[PDB]
Design a protein around this ligand. Structure first.
Ligand SMILES: N[C@@H](CCC(=O)N[C@@H](CS)C(=O)NCC(=O)O)C(=O)O
Ligand SMILES: N[C@@H](CCC(=O)N[C@@H](CS)C(=O)NCC(=O)O)C(=O)O
Lengths: 218, 218
């Protein structure tokens, strides 16, 4: 069983949880709850760059989010059928990571900044990102983004759609195809289970959570 | 011939120029010199996320640095022999990307915070990154980072070694294996040509350069 090392929260590890659950893979989590917990990991020489996420899988101690995701996607055949499909998949997911990065960092923005940031995110979501993905779905009219079959791109997108919903649920409003994809994916047996209460799925970070995580990683 | 769309500067396109030259692939560049040049790319629908880097290759208009790099690495056999070798490669390159991002963003730091940033980069270079890569070279005693064969990780690392040298040439002093890799990789025919004057290799951005790019993208 793959074991995920991270604090008890979303952070950068969430995408990995989504992908494994989607692939139908059982996994364990070992939560870091103190600077000393991180310290131990860091001293065992388990973290190549002395950072987490870190995942123990197939005899490896993989570090670096993209590295972990690529390995998992390939192993479970959610990374396309050829080099060109991987290109489309990577192009789509990097765009998703860019939008997710703005949202993921919103808390660190100073109170005078935040307002300006929020407007920006919303603006880019409606004029930049959602239009781009609605357009690929439109380009071929299939239920999946690439190769007419489930891939990590579909899973990342839907994960991103839920996050956006938490910000402002009206942003997806003028994008039917994205709405249809969200429903379809949320209904796949594996994802539906992951979406239910009590799953390893993590909640949005709250004041307390943010703070406590800042102590650990200092 | 692949065509790279970016401004005449290092920016985020440089790693891609490095990889292609190393693989011995001739390419063309179409420099963006104004907001109008960029505007024409957006209006052509050539930029999926209305951003560059963008590379025209094998019939596609690839965007997103990481997407482009992964495609090129596979095409020219610089991406390992299997899923696990790709995991090591991805892990090593992502760490490299993190250090690079810090150096890349240095010119954006306000004068009052620059010194602290510079200090952080130097410290992390010596206690975090260089030790990690030296350790892997030490682990197997081979000329290359992975599979005892040239790969994108070796090419990326050396480019990074040159950037570090521009900042502080004493930073690599306690890492002989990295020093040897730098010489070894720099002597490969394709890279030696790329390092020679008059090549597509780009210079450090001077005050003016930053200023102009700042205008183009806003
Ligand atoms: N680029 C890395 C970022 C990893 C990272 O910043 N991890 C933070 C927690 S979010 C950490 O471990 N910080 C402690 C440190 O930087 O020493 C990845 O995608 O996995
Ligand atoms: N994550 C993208 C970042 C691309 C990016 O920020 N491109 C800048 C030039 S450095 C741009 O085109 N900015 C114009 C804009 O954001 O509208 C990638 O690695 O390719």
């Amino acid at each position: 069983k793959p074991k995920l090392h991270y604090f008890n929260g979303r952070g950068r590890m969430e995408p990995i949880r989504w992908l494994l659950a989607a692939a139908g893979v059982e996994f364990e989590e070992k939560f870091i709850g103190s600077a000393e917990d991180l310290g131990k990991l860091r001293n065992d020489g388990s973290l190549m760059f002395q950072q987490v996420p870190m995942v123990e899988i197939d005899g490896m101690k993989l570090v670096q989010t993209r590295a972990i995701l690529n390995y998992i996607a390939s192993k479970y055949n959610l990374y396309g059928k050829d080099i060109k499909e991987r290109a489309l998949i990577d192009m789509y997911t990097e765009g998703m990571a860019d939008l997710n990065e703005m949202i993921l960092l919103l808390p660190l923005c100073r109170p005078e900044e935040k307002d300006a940031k929020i407007a920006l995110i919303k603006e880019k979501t409606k004029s930049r990102y959602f239009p781009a993905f609605e357009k690929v779905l439109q380009s071929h009219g299939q239920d999946y983004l690439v190769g007419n079959k489930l891939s990590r791109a579909d899973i990342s997108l839907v994960e991103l759609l839920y996050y956006v919903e938490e910000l402002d649920s009206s942003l997806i409003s003028n994008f039917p195809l994205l709405k249809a994809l969200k429903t379809r994916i949320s209904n796949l047996p594996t994802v539906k289970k992951f979406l239910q209460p009590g799953s390893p799925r993590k909640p949005p970070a709250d004041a307390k959570a943010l703070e406590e995580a800042r102590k650990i990683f200092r």
